[PDB]
């Protein structure tokens, strides 16, 4: 018979994960502490399932506190039951790992997706805006030609809106049309950061801690 | 002869220094001072369970004990060691507690550099990101300016056309005239970035980052 | 001769004070009432368990006991004392309960001093911080004038809600806080004007 005591993973054992949930989720990513709980929960559940398929021991000790956890195997040698326990633990620390990889993926992908949809709605609005303005500039060039405002007659800038664009004068008005192709699209600060979130996400590529390694 | 001590979670004063750290490192993300009392004492009892597990596993055992003093309460904990002499169950118990109180302090200093590293990556990110957002905000404003300079050149405007002067779009920019728009692109490398107040808080928080007591005795050993 | 009693955590009314006190220090980081109650009776049963540990290790041993009453945590708590006489046993039990209650009240003063220290030197931190933000903003507005200066030395020199761009207009040119700041400041005189003005209650006062 061999015994080990294992508790929730420490931060430097999950930092990589926690940072990943952070990039993706941000001010609503789960607290590191609230994650340690989740992982070690996943371990015991799985370890327990490894025990029922063997009819291995999972229980708290100390008596009335979830953590830590005491585990044991009943073998056929000191050397025998020790490593037999080591190898049934690690193999649970793989199943849960594989379960995470397959969760990270579904979270990245739903992240990716949502950011992309947001980018490509800003990028559509920005275009419909630029174009709408190009139409009102063209129509204002006509009004300004028919009334010979050839140079800007603005007393103050509050007066210049769509619907009063011809105040700018037929000349400058010619110029904004002439150069229509180099007038930048206008994007939110939100656009640039969403875009930067999307970059940081697209660059993303353990479950317990041994308080006592198994015994002789 | 059995020696006996009762230990519980360390109180608020005690671990205020450690509480302080975790408040730096994490925002309103940092755990309640209660939750950190728990983690600390829980940490100790765990290293203690390990000490007892192994004491029971020699040629000659030694019987070290830990269990909730009162049944059905997580909260106060009772430890006992079973010795040969009287005074020699009580110097033994107390040392095995000081032996764990040292081990935990070892585990703790490592976990603290970890926490730092991760609160620090967490932040350098949010700075860099906010740096990029503000530099592109600026560069877009500069392309707008480069653009309106053409409009002004073509309309031969060199000097401000406006008396009362409140807020400017891509259309109205050229009213500042080409002498202003031009020196502006000349001095774009010095136009100051505008940031969210959160940017300054975050920045100080990183500055701050670059700056014991697992338990308390309710009764010493006996 | 065995006397028994049944104690549990203090009622909400009994902790109105202590509870608000924590609320004034901690705002909304302050623990639920339920968690405070459990923490006080928690302090009590520890002091009591330490008395039981010691009375037993006397040359002439006294037997004091504490245990859950039901299937709960407390539930409430059953405490007993075993005495030479009836009168003795009941009286000695009620004398010990109250002695423990007194020791704990005294831990509970240090405790409040600590929480208040925690509450204050978090609030000062938040002012240390709105101040640095407010200075950073003021430094910026100052750079946004130093720049609008280079531009206006394109001969503007005099003066046709400014902004980085139309601050061009003039030349001849060139500490303020959120109300939250005056909110934080006020929750710092509320606290620190706040003094020590129940650690359990009786389901069943000590018996025969």
């Amino acid at each position: 018979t061999s015994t080990a005591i294992i508790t929730q993973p420490d931060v430097g054992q999950i930092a990589g994960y926690n940072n990943a949930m952070n990039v993706i989720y941000g001010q609503a990513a789960p607290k590191v502490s609230d994650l340690q709980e989740t992982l070690i929960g996943r371990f015991s559940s799985a370890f327990s399932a490894l025990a029922e398929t063997l009819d291995l021991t999972i229980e708290p000790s100390v008596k009335n506190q979830q953590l830590p956890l005491t585990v044991s195997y009943v073998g056929q040698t000191a050397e025998g039951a020790q490593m037999k326990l080591a190898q049934y633990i690690q193999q649970v620390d793989d199943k849960v790992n594989q379960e995470l990889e397959k969760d990270l993926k579904d979270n990245i992908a739903l992240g990716r997706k949502n950011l992309q949809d947001s980018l490509r709605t800003q990028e559509v609005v920005a275009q419909e805006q630029k174009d709408l303005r190009i139409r009102q500039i063209q129509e204002a060039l006509q009004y300004a030609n028919q009334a010979q405002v050839t140079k800007p007659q603005v007393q103050q800038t509050e007066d210049v809106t769509q619907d009063t664009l011809f105040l700018l004068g037929s000349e400058a008005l010619e110029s904004m049309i002439k150069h229509e192709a180099t007038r930048p699209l206008v994007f939110s600060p939100n656009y640039y950061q969403t875009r930067q979130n999307l970059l940081d996400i697209e660059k993303l590529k353990h479950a317990y801690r041994y308080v006592m390694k198994p015994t002789l």
Side-chain angles (χ1 to χ4, degrees), chain A residues 100 102-119 121-138 140-145:
Chain A
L100 268 4
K102 193 97 189 270
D103 279 339
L104 224 56
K105 265 66 146 168
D106 289 6
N107 272 10
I108 277 168
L110 230 162
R112 258 191 306 230
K113 169 84 175 322
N114 291 140
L115 300 196
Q116 286 177 324
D117 279 3
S118 172
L119 288 187
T121 296
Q122 317 232 282
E123 297 170 346
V124 153
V125 158
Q127 262 166 342
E128 292 178 338
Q129 251 179 244
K130 178 190 189 177
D131 295 353
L132 175 52
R133 182 53 44 81
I134 284 308
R135 222 158 338 183
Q136 311 184 308
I137 283 169
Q138 267 153 11
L141 180 36
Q142 274 194 61
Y143 199 131
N145 273 332

Side-chain angles (χ1 to χ4, degrees), chain A residues 21-33:
Chain A
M21 292 292 296
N22 270 319
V23 170
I24 304 163
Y25 284 99
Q27 85 181 5
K31 309 212 270 167
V32 35
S33 99

Side-chain angles (χ1 to χ4, degrees), chain A residues 147-154 156-162:
Chain A
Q148 296 163 40
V149 203
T150 126
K151 297 197 275 110
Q153 299 287 101
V154 196
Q156 55 178 64
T157 63
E158 128 187 27
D159 305 328
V160 171
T161 55
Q162 40 186 63

